[PDB]
Amino acid sequence: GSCKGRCFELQEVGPPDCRCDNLCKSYSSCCHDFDELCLKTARGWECTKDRCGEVRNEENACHCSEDCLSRGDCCTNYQVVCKGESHWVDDDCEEIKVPECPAGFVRPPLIIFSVDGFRASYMKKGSKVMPNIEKLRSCGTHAPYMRPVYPTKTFPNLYTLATGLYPESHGIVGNSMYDPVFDASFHLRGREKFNHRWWGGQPLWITATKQGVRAGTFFWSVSIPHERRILTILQWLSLPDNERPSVYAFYSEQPDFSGHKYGPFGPEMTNPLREIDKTVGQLMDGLKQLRLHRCVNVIFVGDHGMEDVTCDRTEFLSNYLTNVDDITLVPGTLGRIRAKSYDPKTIIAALTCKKPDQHFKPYMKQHLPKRLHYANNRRIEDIHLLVDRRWHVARKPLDVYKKPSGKCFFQGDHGFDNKVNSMQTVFVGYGPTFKYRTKVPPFENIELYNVMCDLLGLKPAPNNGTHGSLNHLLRTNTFRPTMPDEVSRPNYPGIMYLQSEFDLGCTCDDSTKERHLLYGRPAVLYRTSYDILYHTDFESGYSEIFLMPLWTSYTISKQAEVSSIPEHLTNCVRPDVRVSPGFSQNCLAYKNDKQMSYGFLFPPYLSSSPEAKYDAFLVTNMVPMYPAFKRVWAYFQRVLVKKYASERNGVNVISGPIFDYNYDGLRDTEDEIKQYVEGSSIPVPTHYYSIITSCLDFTQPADKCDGPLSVSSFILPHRPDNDESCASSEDESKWVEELMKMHTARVRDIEHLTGLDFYRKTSRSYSEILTLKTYLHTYES
Ligand SMILES: *[C@@H]1O[C@H](CO)[C@@H](O[C@@H]2O[C@H](CO)[C@@H](O[C@@H]3O[C@H](CO[C@H]4O[C@H](CO[C@H]5O[C@H](CO)[C@@H](O)[C@H](O)[C@@H]5O)[C@@H](O)[C@H](O[C@H]5O[C@H](CO)[C@@H](O)[C@H](O)[C@@H]5O[C@H]5O[C@H](CO)[C@@H](O)[C@H](O)[C@@H]5O)[C@@H]4O)[C@@H](O)[C@H](O)[C@@H]3O)[C@H](O)[C@H]2NC(C)=O)[C@H](O)[C@H]1NC(C)=O
Ligand SMILES: C[C@H](CCC(=O)NCCS(=O)(=O)O)[C@H]1CC[C@H]2[C@@H]3[C@@H](O)C[C@@H]4C[C@H](O)CC[C@]4(C)[C@H]3CC[C@]12C
Ligand SMILES: CCCCCCCC/C=C\CCCCCCCC(=O)OC[C@@H](O)COP(=O)(O)O
Ligand SMILES: [Ca+2]
Ligand code: NA
Ligand code: NA
Ligand SMILES: [Zn+2]
């Protein structure tokens, strides 16, 4: 077969017949004359003055002849150089109220322009280096930065962009990975990645195709130059209505390639950024030449940032482990350890707080911060190393490959914790469906799959985005989110039992809703039996199944006083006459459990009076806590809640337990709970959460807030030691806050882990609430 009349055909031809599509090279399937007909390069990609009105020469890469517009193969700058038109970038910003598309366009097309390793801060270089990108950013909708997923590498992040899924769910958990069920390894180099079996979820091109929206072919063989890809996208946009795709992808390997070689701050980065802008220029000039520049939505998006890293800053496992030849390490800016073909507890202990300024921390994957969502996949090794920004971890010094000079290859790298500043990347949306000259807050790249589906009129496949949380990016929204319906309604028990009926082994020395549930009652979204319990200082939703609160809500004013637990109440636990003895915890179980103590969800320390303080010792306010965790919890309750109330002008706090023994980020059922307090059916939480809300305008108190809300949340691991915190032998003021900042979380994360729905009664729109629920308080900003 021949490629004559078929260059970059959108249909693909099955074997044995030869192909002419943009991927044929990658499958060794092109017709003999593909290069000759489809990959013309003569005279480059730009018209010059001397070429204007030339006699057409079919050898040229693109054309500057009078007939080129009608034939559809002009160079992108043809009208500029030969017809006196202006570059798109030199035109004034003008609002696109409505898509201005040629007749027969059913919807505005979407072009996704992805850049690899584009740090958010590169945008500070401005129009002097990147005038086209700067115009898109200024005129369109932009965020200061976009948060990638962990690990902050290309393959996980690009496939998250495509699917809306965390890597643990889509399956591309690294650039490199081993599947023990396949007994095979996936790598950047080689053929294994072309096997469909690695790739889960439903990416945008499949979602589009299944719902009758033409995607064409996203992927390009890497040897086709950038300029040819741009020209081909433009030619596809000129196809007839029954063939023209509605969505296009362009991907650039820059500025990642340069970032690795020169570091993110090297003066050598300027040129690669200029070249990316030149390519954006060609696209926009090219669209303008087709009169599609006010028709198409363009997304300019990065996969991750780039950090300064050097050979000099490498930790070696051979300095900790006596037995490194028995382990396989996925090295670099993260660590994944498994057996060569070895004991996990030994390895973790040998890597835990062994050197004073140790530049990595080992975790069993279930103990990683829940915000990373990096555990529920067989391709994720049990042992994980979180590596400090600017550092590498390697197995042994002679595992590190060198350049001929002896020095390491990289001055830049990425892959670190996705809350690290240097890993943040970019988002700009420009076009008829995006807002005009609008800044939006930072958001996570898991949210974009939904947006792209909305931009194409597609129903998204189930994903980890919160659909509606990015409605404020768009001028017009084809998705209106609705609050989920409550599944279980509470009971409201009154006094039902006499104290004499209780023998729990306990002893003690003898406008609630309005004040303490500021944003309404959380809805329970699964089938269960629970009670609303009111008190002077706090309200709770008490589970009869788990024998403790699902949530506890209370408000602490700026002027609230902290008091001590009187010595005589130290061991006070009181039966709750509203709740059956059989639905209550018992003190005997804690006495007999050598490892387990207990804490309180509402802190006795913040009670409004000595009289009300007795409510805080109710058995229905008690939760199981390891003595090590009580050090953390007690400092949070006695010191930090009041600090936050002073800083934020009051806070509302909702605290509760989380059960996630199978580490899937979702509420466990009873069956899935694997640990109970000794001799009892009191389940042991894997984590404790808190959601701390106040007024965004801190000049207004939390309980009289007219406007937007401000939230910070955490999901603290409920651990029997503080081995995670290397300073834990010191006073809690030296390490507890650091622990908590590491385990910051979104409200949405807590919702997945609890089956609760928060903020059900506010004066805010539901899409603004959805935005609030996806917010992550990072303590870099
Ligand atoms: C983030 O969002 C995710 C998506 O909503 C949430 O994951 C989902 O979690 C639910 C609840 O536990 C799971 O429900 C069980 O599914 C079982 C059915 O098995 C399979 O069917 C799924 C549907 O497949 C059809 O539809 C999709 C459209 O999206 C198409 O892509 C398919 O072609 C097909 O038409 C399928 O999605 C699922 O896929 C996984 O498994 C394969 C291997 O077989 C992997 O290649 C792939 O990467 C997925 O793996 C992930 O999930 C599995 C659990 O299924 C994990 O073991 C694995 O470690 C990895 O995390 C599968 O083949 C059914 O028998 C049960 O009764 C449940 O109904 C969904 O399967 C699951 N979906 C996905 C994509 O993972 C996730 O909870 C959420 N996370 C948070 C924190 O909120
Ligand atoms: C990552 C890769 C592009 C970069 C590159 O390395 N180019 C190859 C040059 S070389 O190695 O031959 O020298 C793309 C190209 C085709 C894609 C594949 C597609 O064809 C077919 C599949 C489509 C599925 O929905 C996703 C998985 C799937 C297997 C794609 C995964 C990603 C694939 C492999
Ligand atoms: C809407 C989605 C956005 C557009 C593209 C989505 C495609 C997602 C699908 C699969 C992931 C890989 C797609 C191929 C792109 C190029 C892959 C590649 O070879 O990247 C260079 C890589 O060595 C750099 O790795 P890093 O060291 O992690 O930067
Ligand atoms: Ca679970
Ligand atoms: Na005990
Ligand atoms: Na410690
Ligand atoms: Zn890279």
Numbering used by the authors: 56 to 396, 402 to 570, 590 to 860
Sentences from the paper on this structure:
Autotaxin (ATX) is a secreted lysophospholipase D (lysoPLD) that produces the bioactive lipid lysophosphatidic acid (LPA) from extracellular lysophospholipids, predominantly lysophosphatidylcholine (LPC). Crystal structures of ATX89 (ENPP2) revealed a catalytic domain with a bimetallic active site adjacent to a catalytic threonine. Substrate binding takes place in a shallow hydrophilic groove that accommodates nucleotides as well as the glycerol moiety of lysophospholipids, and in a deep hydrophobic pocket binding the lysophospholipid acyl chain. In addition, the catalytic domain together with the first of two somatomedin-β (SMB) domains, form a tunnel adjacent to the active site.
Crucially, mathematical modelling indicated that TUDCA is a noncompetitive inhibitor, implying that LPC or LPA can co-exist in a ternary complex with ATX. To test this hypothesis, we crystallized a complex of ATX, TUDCA and LPA and we determined a structure of this ternary complex to 1.8 Å resolution. In this complex, TUDCA is well defined in density and the steroid moiety lies in the tunnel, but the conjugated tail is in a single well-defined conformation pointing away from the active site.
